[PDB]
């Protein structure tokens, strides 16, 4: 994350770390939506152009972490992956449309002060909150400054406003579909703050004033990150029926 800050302890209990088994490293961010299901971005797992096709055995998920590198014993929880479910219409050739994936854990994880599922939005919540200017939150262990070509010590958090669809459309050459939305401040505002590549797959959350709960409205698909423009997020509610289909058909 760029221009954010250290997240407070348990400030984002649903934050998940997609950890590459070997070489050992941070793969992406993700989120806990139930004791057995983790949601993330599809491009973190699948991208043929660079022949990236991680199998369940190449990864692990670490839940309840704060520190990026320390093994936080009796706090974090490491789980193995039972199965990965990339959206069937994930468009990696074109524009990461439907950049989403589901991961079923091998065994259910127990919740704690540091491990807790985030809510998925329903129609009204999506209608109420998904408006230009309203702000959502992003968290991750991604990079901090423009990739000079850096890493944070602990989980980073930052708030960003949703951008008007047209403004966003006019900001890129990419065909932004109705399954995505943008967030980020205007280039003039000098008020930066964004998610970088390491933060992709992580959650974009919003706190509902109606019930005081946190909802994941989007998944970090391509943050205008540590780049030299707005970030792109997967529209979770637009892809809600698929999510439930997977969790209903698969999973106990």
């Amino acid at each position: 994350i760029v221009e954010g800050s250290d997240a407070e302890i348990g400030m984002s209990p649903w934050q998940v770390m997609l950890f590459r088994k070997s070489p050992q490293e941070l793969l992406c961010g993700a989120s806990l939506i139930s004791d057995r299901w983790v949601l993330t971005a599809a491009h973190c797992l699948l991208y043929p152009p660079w022949d990236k096709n991680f199998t369940e055995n190449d990864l692990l998920v670490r839940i309840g972490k704060h520190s990026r590198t320390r093994y936080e014993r009796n706090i974090e929880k490491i789980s193995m992956l039972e199965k990965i479910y990339i959206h069937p219409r994930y468009n990696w050739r074109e524009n990461l449309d439907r950049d989403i994936a589901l991961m079923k854990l091998k065994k259910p994880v127990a919740f704690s002060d540091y491990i807790h599922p985030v809510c998925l939005p329903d129609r009204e919540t999506a209608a109420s909150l998904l408006q230009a200017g309203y702000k959502g939150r992003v968290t991750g262990w991604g990079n901090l400054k423009e990739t000079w070509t850096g890493q944070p010590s602990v989980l980073q958090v930052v708030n960003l406003p949703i951008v008007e669809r047209p403004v966003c459309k006019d900001s890129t050459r990419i065909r932004i579909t109705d399954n995505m939305f943008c967030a980020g401040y205007k280039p003039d505002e000098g008020k930066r703050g964004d998610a970088c590549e390491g933060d992709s797959g992580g959650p974009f959350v919003m706190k509902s004033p109606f019930n005081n709960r946190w909802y994941q409205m989007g998944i970090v698909s391509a943050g205008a990150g540590c780049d030299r423009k707005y970030g792109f997020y997967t529209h979770v509610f637009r892809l809600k029926k698929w999510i439930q289909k997977v969790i209903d058909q698969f999973g106990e």
Partner: peptide, 9 residues
């Protein structure tokens, strides 16, 4: 480099 503290069980 950039080492992550060993872990698991």
């Amino acid at each position: 480099n950039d080492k992550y503290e060993p872990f698991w069980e």
